[PDB]
Amino acid sequence: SAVKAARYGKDNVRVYKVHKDEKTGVQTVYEMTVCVLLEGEIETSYTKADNSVIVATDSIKNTIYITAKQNPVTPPELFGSILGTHFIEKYNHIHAAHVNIVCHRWTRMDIDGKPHPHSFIRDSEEKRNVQVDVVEGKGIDIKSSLSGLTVLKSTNSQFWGFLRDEYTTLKETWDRILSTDVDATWQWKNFSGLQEVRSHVPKFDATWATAREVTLKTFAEDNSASVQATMYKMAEQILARQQLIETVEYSLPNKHYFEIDLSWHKGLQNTGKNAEVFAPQSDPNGLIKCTVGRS
Amino acid sequence: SAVKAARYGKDNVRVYKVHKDEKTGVQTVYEMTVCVLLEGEIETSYTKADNSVIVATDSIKNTIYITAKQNPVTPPELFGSILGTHFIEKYNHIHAAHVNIVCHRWTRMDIDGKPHPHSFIRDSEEKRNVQVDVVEGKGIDIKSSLSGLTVLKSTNSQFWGFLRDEYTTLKETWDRILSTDVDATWQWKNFSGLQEVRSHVPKFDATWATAREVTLKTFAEDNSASVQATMYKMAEQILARQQLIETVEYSLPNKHYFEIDLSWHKGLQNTGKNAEVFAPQSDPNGLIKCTVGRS
Amino acid sequence: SAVKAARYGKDNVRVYKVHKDEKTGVQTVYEMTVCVLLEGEIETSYTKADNSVIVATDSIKNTIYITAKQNPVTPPELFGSILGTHFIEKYNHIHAAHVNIVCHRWTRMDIDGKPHPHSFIRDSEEKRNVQVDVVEGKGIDIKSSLSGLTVLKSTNSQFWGFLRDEYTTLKETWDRILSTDVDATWQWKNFSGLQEVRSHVPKFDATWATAREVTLKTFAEDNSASVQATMYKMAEQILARQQLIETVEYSLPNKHYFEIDLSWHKGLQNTGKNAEVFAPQSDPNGLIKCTVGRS
Amino acid sequence: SAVKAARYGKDNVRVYKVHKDEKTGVQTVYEMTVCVLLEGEIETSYTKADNSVIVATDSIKNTIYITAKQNPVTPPELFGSILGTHFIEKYNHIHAAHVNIVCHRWTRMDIDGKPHPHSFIRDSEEKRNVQVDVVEGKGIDIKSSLSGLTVLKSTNSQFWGFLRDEYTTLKETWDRILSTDVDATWQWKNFSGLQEVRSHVPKFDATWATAREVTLKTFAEDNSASVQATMYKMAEQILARQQLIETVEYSLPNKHYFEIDLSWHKGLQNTGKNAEVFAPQSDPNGLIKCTVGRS
Ligand SMILES: O=c1[nH]c(=O)c2nn[nH]c2[nH]1
Ligand SMILES: O=c1[nH]c(=O)c2nn[nH]c2[nH]1
Ligand SMILES: O=c1[nH]c(=O)c2nn[nH]c2[nH]1
Ligand SMILES: O=c1[nH]c(=O)c2nn[nH]c2[nH]1
Ligand SMILES: [Ar]
Ligand SMILES: [Ar]
Ligand SMILES: [Ar]
Ligand SMILES: [Ar]
Ligand SMILES: [Ar]
Ligand SMILES: [Ar]
Ligand SMILES: [Ar]
Ligand SMILES: [Ar]
Ligand code: NA
Ligand code: NA
Ligand code: NA
Ligand code: NA
């Protein structure tokens, strides 16, 4: 047998960084979880117990904290590119660095209507993520995402006109609840290297803001024919709003809220126009995926 | 052998309710998870396979949905009181109903600076909870809480002058990170029954808002001597601002953020006044608890 | 305002210990998660920023590791008793130590039908737990438990003859699935102190083994009238088999498996005697509790 | 813009099936979680609100329960192939069915040393999984796996000879703890369709048994030079033992157990040969991946 593929490194590296403006006393905090996996001429660590080719996962962990000390950790697209570039440049025999970052929310507190200089709240488990693949000779491939953005609308969702056969029980509806956990990913044009990533740094925060704003507005305002039709509208707007993105991907659960027929109890009316009380369904869930690109 | 205590019922009952204003078109959503456990003359269900005494957990589930249909689900102190009162009043042999409610956040979306009439975001995993114990002959005992309120301050936390002996390694500090998940409970004066709960309804939302505001402002503004000293100031203020509360209880983890000595690497300075990059510790954690009452 | 209750210490302390027999080469591993909370004359740490009274949670953490180094970590009732006794004996102003231990399974691997000397599998998420409350002047109160013991029987469960009224939809059944996660606790007679705990050491492993054996055999063999009736028979037998236990407590979810009527599809029969395919329900769940003591 | 890729369906479908031998009274239970995602000529559901092309996720859920009623649910490779084949054959415009199955453990109880006819224990959260991709014109691609197999050895693990530079702090060791959660995947030769999958049905259970046996024996017996070197030995043995597999993939966390220097406390010796008490590290973790094929 032979090694067809291999990658290794350190996962679940928790990092915090603080910025202190000594002039204003304003502090800004950043918290992330980092994974770095390396590829290269490392076959022999698997086949021949040749540890000489292994940059120790412990050393990869140290390198994450050192890089965080010596560079901005924002935007995560840039930090990931710096960290990935370090490994392929430092080590002749390392040819790819795969850097995943989950960014945790620390939103500045407003106390008596003024932003507090050094106190933060985790407003939601919503994440901002990157996958940065730094490949020697093939530049830097960046996927950006937001995930765990949990939303519900109580009307202006519909689902009718779907295929009906001997497997179908679902009633058509012209008025339902729609609730999802938004996972939205935008795939950047290939970058030639760290210089080109740096040249575009402001577009990262901007495009995340756009993706989040388009997601929330389209969800709120679309009189939805389906998850499919609504998610496509989000993707096409994001593409129209950032030329450097090639594709937008959505992965959306349909988190069902079922009507509860109470007519067995004192003729209580709680269906159709009378529906007030619903049973949120933990499982199963619809799962709807799309990747949208330019025509 | 004999039954010394027994309670039974339905846990993890997910409930959603919508209110629709037909004049303004504005919709408001409520989502909770409910547990109801019953006590009474039920020992024979355990000792003698006497199911005649069981109000089926399935029937308790139906009753939660029916009660939500026929009553306001807010504030949760009132809904719990109504639900618990139902069981002890309806069934001669049921003498206690223990109602736990977890309220899930659905915060109205602002789209283009305007509140949306029917679109919501889960803006934190923070919960608002009640435990309502309805006991025949002994009234209604309510504990109200907020939980999952995750906060961090980057400075204006200290920990020095603790006991130092042969078990002590911790360095004194005059400037550290403090981060916690706030679990805060306020225990109401005993209520005689549902009428007395109804007479205090506005105080529930008001006291929750006070508890949250005091928590956030005190956390942000206190130059903290310890978790102990800071949580005590929160509890004090809440007691001073609602005379119908007997006690305020805090349970606070100390979610440690450790400095990282990088001086082994090219003499990099990242401790004391140079500390920028920290290692968030998943475990272990300080756990600090208080119950504060009136002098 | 005044402190009515306070306790503080270190939670989520992960501990591993290995025993190595140098003669046989056989190694034995223990892994636990420990929480120690202290009470005593500590109110001034809350009211007056008086840290002089705090045994640092960091120091409690060190003490857990040192105690594990200097004593057996098994049975957990003994280790907890030793750990708790340390704090109240060492520190004049500490009057109570509350020790919780979760024991993680590391079961020796059988390789080619032979027990391996140093290789282990986590063969369930089932835990063995203790809560050891060491209170100066009032001895040592131990609750022992098994939890996370997940079981299912496919028949020989029934539920009929429960109360039927206008809230009732549940059909009587003489043949259903029963599945639960067993949480079983046995409360020991108060011990005068560490000497008395040491005098009963063999009874801890023996009573845990009895509790587990009775749970499994009674679950498997009882033609169950209800969760209530089955859990009571378990508690009875355990009380009858260890006179040093005062009470046995069960907390059992009813993890519902619902029949699926498929008769709408080509007249497929999948209910009653034809029931083969079921929908496991994540939520809600029955929750049935008992505490059984001696007549 | 345009749809580059799309797939949709139902996730987290919990299924239970029982087999009853009426002759012997022996019952056998199976429990799984199923996901089915469909591809085909469905672009217009996204682009034009054309729901005519949507087989409702609700209908996909019904189809899972009907297929489970009408077919064996074991081995999961076969059930997945039947379920996937159903969608591409039933619907002209559906061209691929992607079927993921997680199999949950229900191990028959031994009561007084005899296997019980209808009582089961969940021995471990270890899963057996399949990914079955049924693609019209391109046959059936099956990945089989075991996951969540949690193991530890207390010695006969080493890690020395790794690269040392200005980023390295890790001490070489000739005797450490090694603990992992095994995720092992074997990729089958492409099958032309359901007939060819059926022709190989016994190899599925056999190859799972082999994979699990090789994993446990190699882990227990290898005097490990690294995770890399040990996982490669497992993969090469599985390939040698089943000709119909093309690749074996392992993904292994290195779940670190750190020594605790206690020499600051009464010169306590707990390092190197004296190491008894360790701190299990929740995070970060080494992550080591390999895909092995034939040379
Ligand atoms: O088995 C190991 N492999 C590695 O790559 C590694 N790096 N640090 N420790 C390690 N252990
Ligand atoms: O065993 C049971 N106990 C109960 O109290 C119950 N209620 N519904 N189903 C039930 N099953
Ligand atoms: O605020 C704190 N309280 C404590 O009791 C403590 N112990 N270690 N660190 C601490 N921080
Ligand atoms: O938005 C929806 N899309 C679907 O594909 C679907 N299927 N059932 N319900 C549904 N809702
Ligand atoms: Ar960070
Ligand atoms: Ar959507
Ligand atoms: Ar609700
Ligand atoms: Ar605090
Ligand atoms: Ar241990
Ligand atoms: Ar039971
Ligand atoms: Ar199944
Ligand atoms: Ar391994
Ligand atoms: Na390189
Ligand atoms: Na009553
Ligand atoms: Na004492
Ligand atoms: Na087809």
Please state the three-class secondary structure of B261-284 as a single string. Answer: CCCCCCCCCCCHHHCCEEEECCCC
Q: Other C-beta atoms within 10 Å of B163: how many? A: 16
Cα separation, B9 vs A290, in Å, equals 43
Dig out the tokens for A104 from the structure: 């945790």
Cα separation, D199 vs D258, in Å, equals 50
The SS3 assignment for D208 reads helix
| CA dist list (Å): C153 to C179, C220, C254, D92, D119 | 6, 7, 12, 42, 4
Where are the domains positioned within chain C?
A: 1-295
Q: Other C-beta atoms within 10 Å of B168: how many? A: 17
Touching chains, B (3+ CB pairs < 8 A): A, C, D
| CA dist list (Å): A222 to A186, A225, A231, C11 | 21, 9, 10, 48
Q: Is the peptide bond before B115 cis (omega within 30 degrees of 0)?
A: no
Length of chain B measured in residues: 295
Identify which of A62, A22, A9, A14 has the alpha carbon closest to the alpha carbon of residue B268. Answer: A62
Q: Closest to D166 (Cβ–Cβ): which among B166, B265, B282?
A: B265
| Under 8 Å between Cβ of C146 and C215 | yes
**Helix pair angle (B76-90, B57-70), 10° resolution:** 130
Element holding C209 (H helix, E strand): helix C201-221
Identify which of B183, B257, B175, B271 has the alpha carbon closest to the alpha carbon of residue B224. Answer: B175
Length of chain C measured in residues: 295
Dig out the tokens for A70 from the structure: 């010596």
Cα separation, B236 vs B294, in Å, equals 9
D228 is in an annotated binding site: yes
Cα separation, A93 vs C73, in Å, equals 46
The SS3 assignment for A134 reads strand
Instruction: Answer yes or no: is the C-beta of A159 below 6 A from any ligand 4 atom.
Output: yes
C10 is catalytic: yes
Cα separation, A231 vs D5, in Å, equals 13
Cα separation, B86 vs D16, in Å, equals 36
Element holding C213 (H helix, E strand): helix C201-221
**Which residues, in sequence order, are CB contacts of C71 under 8 Å at separation 6+?**
C78, C79, C82
Length of chain D measured in residues: 295
Q: Is the peptide bond before B75 cis (omega within 30 degrees of 0)?
A: yes
| The amino acid at C150 | T
The SS3 assignment for A126 reads coil
- Point out the ligand nearest to the CA of residue A94: 13
Query: Count of H helices and E strands in chain D?
Result: 6, 12
CA-nearest residue to B288 within chain C is C8
| Under 8 Å between Cβ of B39 and B7 | yes
- Give the distance, in angstroms, between the CA of residue C237 and the centroid of all CA atoms in the same chain: 18
| CA dist list (Å): B71 to B65, C182, D41 | 10, 36, 48
Identify which of A98, A119, A94 has the alpha carbon closest to the alpha carbon of residue A109. Answer: A119
Resolution stated for this PDB structure, in Å: 1.6
Q: Mutation test of the interface with chain C: which of B45, B50, B294, choosing the one with the most C Cβ atoms within 10 A?
A: B45
| Under 8 Å between Cβ of D219 and C122 | no
* Phi-psi domain of D39 (left: phi exceeds 0; alpha: psi -120 through 50; beta: other): beta
CB pairs under 8 A between A and D: 226
Touching chains, A (3+ CB pairs < 8 A): B, C, D
> Does A27 touch chain B if contact means CB atoms closer than 8 Å?
yes
Cα separation, B69 vs A279, in Å, equals 12
- Give the distance, in angstroms, between the CA of residue B75 and the centroid of all CA atoms in the same chain: 14
| CA dist list (Å): B152 to A21, B147, C267 | 18, 15, 60
Q: Other C-beta atoms within 10 Å of B114: how many? A: 9
> Does B58 touch chain D if contact means CB atoms closer than 8 Å?
no
DSSP 8-state code for residue C128: E
Q: Other C-beta atoms within 10 Å of A220: how many? A: 22
Cβ separation B167–D282 shorter than 8 A: no
The SS3 assignment for A213 reads helix
Dig out the tokens for C215 from the structure: 């749970």
Cα of C94 from ligand 4 centre, angstroms? 61
Cα separation, B230 vs D221, in Å, equals 54
| Under 8 Å between Cβ of D215 and D184 | yes
Dig out the tokens for A214 from the structure: 């388009």
Question: What is the b/e burial string over B230-257, where b = at least 16 CB atoms within 10 angstroms of the residue's CB?
Answer: bbbbbbbbbbeeeeebebbbbbbbbbbb
| Under 8 Å between Cβ of A105 and A124 | yes
Cα separation, D234 vs D182, in Å, equals 11
| Under 8 Å between Cβ of B61 and B10 | yes
Q: Please tell me the residue having the least CA distance from ligand 12 atom 1.
A: D227
- C-alpha angle A222-A225-A230 in degrees, rounded to nearest 5: 50
Dig out the tokens for C240 from the structure: 């009858």
C124: closest CA of chain B, how far (Å): 22
Largest CA distance in chain B: 78
| Under 8 Å between Cβ of C30 and C16 | yes
Cα separation, C259 vs C261, in Å, equals 7
Identify which of B84, B81, B79 has the alpha carbon closest to the alpha carbon of residue B68. Answer: B79
Identify which of B26, B69, B63 has the alpha carbon closest to the alpha carbon of residue A274. Answer: B69
Question: What is the b/e burial string over C115-137, where b = at least 16 CB atoms within 10 angstroms of the residue's CB?
Answer: ebbbbbbbbbbbbbbbbbbbbbe
Identify which of B138, B157, B58, B45 has the alpha carbon closest to the alpha carbon of residue B98. Answer: B138
| Under 8 Å between Cβ of A152 and A224 | no
The annotation places the binding site of B for O2 at: 57, 254
Cα separation, B47 vs B51, in Å, equals 10
CA-nearest residue to A33 within chain B is B280
Mark which residues 172-211 of D lie under 8 Å from A by CB: none
* Ligand 2, residues at Cβ distance < 6 Å: B 8, 54, 56-58; C 159, 170, 226-228, 254, 286, 288
**Which residues, in sequence order, are CB contacts of B123 under 8 Å at separation 6+?**
A123, A124, B105, B107
| Under 8 Å between Cβ of C25 and C117 | yes
| Under 8 Å between Cβ of B78 and B201 | yes
Q: Which long-range contacts (CB under 8 A, 24 or more apart) does B112-119 make?
A: B112/A217, B116/A220, B117/B24, B117/B25, B117/B26, B117/B27, B118/A153, B118/A154, B118/A155, B118/A156, B118/B25, B118/B26, B118/B27, B119/A151, B119/A152, B119/A153, B119/A216, B119/A219, B119/A220
Span between the terminal Cα atoms of chain A, in Å: 44
Which one of A156, A157, A159, A258 would you pick to mutate in the ligand 4 pocket, going by the greatest count of ligand atoms within 8 A of its CB? A159
The SS3 assignment for C101 reads strand
Cα separation, D36 vs D87, in Å, equals 10
Residues of D in contact with C109 (CB under 8 A): 151, 216, 220
Length of chain A measured in residues: 295
| CA dist list (Å): B86 to B91, B234, C168 | 8, 36, 15
Cα separation, D77 vs D85, in Å, equals 12
- Point out the ligand nearest to the CA of residue C95: 15
Write the burial class of residue D209 (CB in 10 Å: 0-12 exposed, 13-18 middle, 19+ buried).
exposed
Cα separation, D219 vs D212, in Å, equals 11
Cα of C195 from ligand 4 centre, angstroms? 66
Cβ separation B280–A16 shorter than 8 A: yes
Cα separation, D291 vs C240, in Å, equals 56
* Phi-psi domain of B280 (left: phi exceeds 0; alpha: psi -120 through 50; beta: other): beta
> Does B171 touch chain D if contact means CB atoms closer than 8 Å?
no
Touching chains, D (3+ CB pairs < 8 A): A, B, C
Dig out the tokens for D256 from the structure: 């670190």
Cα separation, D36 vs D130, in Å, equals 12
